[PDB]
């Protein structure tokens, strides 16, 4: 147990991979490379298994920081999911991925409202989920 290497003891999710990268990558590369494989990437995030896909990181905001529901109800990212899905997160030192979702509040592409999603509980679909028309 003396110095090894262990075996990337990381979610499956995009921490996961933007994880992977921060191994490799540098910090200006990295971002890029990683935000583009979220982007237009569907993730089931592990809340009760939904799938969006990622096509912006708010690099600004985490599972820590605060946000409205999407509606207005203010809860810290993590509480979100782990204390309204059960998804405890404990990673929430990556960014967010605000990703285009199929929840159409009404037909004929063009979108409904994002899903700001956390890199460590969604798990990486490589789905794309094309999804809308727009």
Same mark, same amino acid.
């Given at each position: 147990c003396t110095d090894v290497s262990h075996k990337?003891? $990381?979610?499956?999710t995009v921490l996961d991979f933007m994880f992977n990268f921060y191994h490799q990558t540098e910090e200006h590369k990295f971002q890029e490379q990683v935000s583009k494989e979220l982007i237009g990437l569907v993730v089931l995030t592990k809340y009760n298994n939904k799938t969006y896909r990622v096509d912006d990181i708010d690099w600004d905001q985490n599972p820590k920081s605060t946000f409205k529901k999407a509606d207005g109800s203010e809860v810290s990212f993590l509480e979100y999911y782990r204390? #309204?899905?059960? #998804?405890?997160? @404990?990673? &929430?030192k990556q960014p967010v991925l605000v990703s285009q979702p199929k $929840? $159409? $509040? %009404?037909? %004929? %592409? @063009? &979108?409904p409202g994002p899903a700001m999603l956390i890199p460590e509980l969604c798990y990486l679909t490589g789905l794309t989920d094309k999804m809308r028309n727009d």
């Open positions: 990337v003891l $990381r979610s499956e204390k #309204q899905y059960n #998804q405890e997160i @404990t990673d &929430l $929840r $159409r $509040r %009404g037909p %004929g %592409g @063009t &979108l």
